[PDB]
Design a binder for this molecule. Structure first.
Ligand code: VO4
Length: 282
């Protein structure tokens, strides 16, 4: 009854209205606009909320869902990589979760540079990739872990842990069990990296805009939103926060497409009901 079809239908009705009203107008004041002709948005219909935008020239947003703070972004375009690495280093990123599959990255029709599995040089930034462990998440889903070392003359060298989910296909929802296992692995990776900074007395530990997990897939609204939703529900400080509020916050802070497919919302609904967490605001 609280997770019955009538309550599910009400939740869908509310989120669809919000999705429809957040669709971007041409030169929409709510959304970050491209500058001097350079391409900003990987997909023209999937834009970057201006108020929460992390950098002028990235499609990337600060996300706060109840108490959980992350960054969600699109897969960076080739032109955006140097700026993308700057954001990663400046945020002292405690984990980068890449949810785009090995098959999508390999398809050169998609323009998805292989920026975390190869070493490379992007303007003044030098990046070293090292492959570390591989972790099965269940149901055949696999995670490859990397460390990206970001170097730049005159800058503090920053190392970033990477969780790469290699085979979660676009436009699908992995299972609730897999989703919980992925969220646990991403949170634990982030906690280990935060503990390191804290053990060195790092002043970045006290800045809320910093030490945020960075999560992207191809567009940054589908597999990304499912993972953020699960990470939110795994934070004990977010007691009583409803699915409606959780998805509404993601949409008003990024775009109206957050939680792209019904199947992805269905996994958030399963995870909520397993917690006795409300679907709707009262
Ligand atoms: O690359 V995603 O379509 O799951 O936003």
């Amino acid at each position: 009854s609280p997770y019955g079809p009538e309550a599910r239908a009400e939740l869908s009705s509310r989120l669809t209205t919000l999705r429809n009203t957040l669709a971007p107008a041409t030169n929409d004041p709510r959304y970050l606009q491209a500058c001097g002709g350079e391409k900003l948005n990987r997909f023209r219909d999937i834009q970057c909320r201006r108020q929460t935008a992390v950098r002028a020239d990235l499609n990337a947003n600060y996300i706060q869902v109840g108490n959980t703070r992350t960054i969600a972004c699109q897969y960076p375009l080739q032109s955006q990589l140097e700026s993308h690495f700057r954001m990663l280093a400046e945020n002292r990123t405690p984990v980068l979760a890449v949810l785009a599959s090995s098959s999508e990255i390999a398809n050169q029709r998609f323009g998805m540079p292989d920026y975390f599995r190869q070493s490379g040089t992007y303007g003044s930034i030098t990046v070293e990739s090292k492959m570390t462990q591989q972790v099965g998440l269940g149901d055949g889903i696999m995670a490859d872990m990397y460390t990206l070392t970001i170097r730049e003359a005159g800058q503090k060298t920053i190392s970033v842990p990477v969780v790469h989910v290699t085979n979660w296909p676009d436009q699908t929802a992995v299972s609730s069990e897999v989703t919980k296992a992925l969220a646990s692995l991403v949170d634990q990776t982030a906690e280990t990296k935060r503990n390191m900074y804290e053990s060195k007395g790092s002043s970045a530990v006290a800045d809320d805009s910093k030490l945020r997990p960075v999560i992207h897939c191809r567009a940054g609204v589908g597999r990304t939103a499912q993972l953020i939703g699960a990470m939110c529900m795994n934070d004990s400080r977010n007691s009583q926060l409803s699915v409606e509020d959780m998805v509404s916050q993601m949409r008003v802070q990024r775009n109206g497409i957050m939680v792209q497919k019904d199947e992805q919302l269905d996994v958030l609904i399963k995870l909520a009901e397993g917690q006795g967490r409300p679907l709707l605001n009262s």
